[PDB]
């Protein structure tokens, strides 16, 4: 119901998010994923590291430069999981993937914007408690991603700025709600209450 | 598109091509190389289309073409036009 | 990775480094860092910024 949808990857499952996103792009919705480093996978760390190693040992033998390119970042892991769903070898699939943008962390201009979630892809809702899960920043740093220490240092600044913003907005909202409560009990407000507002 | 996944490639290429082609079409229209509408006075719809007669009447009204006229055919056209105007005059009278 | 966001040069430079910037030195007017030296004016607001 929007021109563009920003999705916070925190607390989500890679494959389910990939499925819903792919079917949205193929329908024509523009989507932007952020905080891929906080993304989650089902199963313990060991299993998924073993899986990535199984993927990593695969390579064209007579020339390694033309084989499966093993991208280490969480954004690229998610992009792989997604591209395997889309028929990316078609113009339709290319145009679909060109409606997508994946980012580690929340950079500008999306930091000053609203983010959403997908409840049929969240870990806490889809998984049963008492089940091991894996996080993608840890996995990528294990398999050779050399940037997890900068993204944390930057998110620690973004969060402070956002907290200042929220502390301002929350006092403004208190003022507004108090003024509205004082305006209430007027006959205009009674009519609005009757009509459902 | 793998080295830059967050950059559109094909949509930009197609934007470029469609604008490419639209400009060329508009200029081919401005240069009068495309044929006019069906009802315009200079149009040739329902008539016969022959570059020989077109060149004949153009050189009677009297920058590189493959269109010539074959003086043989020019003499033939003058002959047949004399016959045509003879018949028209016999209608005359 | 690492990104360069600004580079600052000195006021006066030698014909040697100017030659490094140039590829046909004997024909040029040698106009390399003129406007930068001009940007090194009274207080150097840009330089200090």
């Amino acid at each position: 119901v929007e021109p563009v949808v920003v999705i916070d990857g925190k607390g989500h499952l890679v494959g389910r998010l990939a499925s819903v996103v792919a079917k949205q792009l193929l329908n024509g919705q523009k989507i932007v994923v952020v905080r891929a480093e906080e993304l989650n996978i089902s199963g313990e760390f060991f299993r998924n590291k073993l899986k990535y190693h199984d993927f990593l040992r695969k390579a064209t033998a007579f020339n390694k430069t033309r084989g499966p390119f093993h991208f280490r970042a969480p954004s690229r892991i998610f992009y792989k999981a997604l591209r395997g769903m889309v028929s990316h070898k078609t113009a339709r699939g290319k145009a679909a993937l060109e409606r997508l943008k994946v980012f580690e962390g929340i950079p500008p201009p999306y930091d000053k914007k609203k983010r959403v979630v997908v409840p049929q892809a969240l870990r806490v809702l889809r998984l049963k408690p008492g089940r091991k899960y894996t996080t993608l920043g840890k996995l990528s740093t294990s398999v050779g991603w050399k940037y997890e220490d900068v993204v944390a240092k930057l998110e620690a600044k973004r969060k402070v700025s956002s907290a200042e913003y929220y502390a301002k907005k929350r006092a403004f909202t208190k003022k507004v709600a108090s003024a509205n409560a004082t305006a209430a009990e007027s006959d205009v407000a009674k009519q609005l209450a009757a009509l459902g507002y | 598109s793998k080295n830059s996944i967050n950059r559109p490639k094909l949509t930009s290429n197609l934007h470029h091509k469609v604008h490419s082609l639209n400009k060329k079409r508009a200029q081919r229209e401005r240069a009068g190389l495309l044929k006019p509408a069906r009802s315009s006075v200079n149009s040739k719809s329902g008539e016969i289309k022959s570059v020989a007669l077109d060149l004949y009447f153009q050189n009677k009204k009297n920058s590189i073409t493959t269109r010539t006229l074959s003086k043989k055919r020019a003499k033939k056209i003058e002959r047949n036009l004399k016959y045509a105007t003879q018949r028209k005059l016999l209608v005359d009278a | 990775g690492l990104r360069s966001l600004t580079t600052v040069w000195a006021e006066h430079l030698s014909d040697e480094v100017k030659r490094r910037f140039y590829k046909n030195w004997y024909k040029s007017k040698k106009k390399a860092f003129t406007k930068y030296s001009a940007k090194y004016a009274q207080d150097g607001a840009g330089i200090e910024r």
Binding site: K30, K101, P108, P109 | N6, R7, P8, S12, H15 | -
Partner: peptide, 27 residues
């Protein structure tokens, strides 16, 4: 800004990017 030419050059780059749709962050 840097106030001399970076302003014009950067706004022109961004508008070329937004007309050709060749921008990494913006659509």
């Amino acid at each position: 800004w840097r106030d001399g030419r970076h302003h014009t050059y950067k706004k022109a780059k961004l508008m070329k990017q937004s007309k050709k749709k060749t921008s990494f962050t913006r659509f």
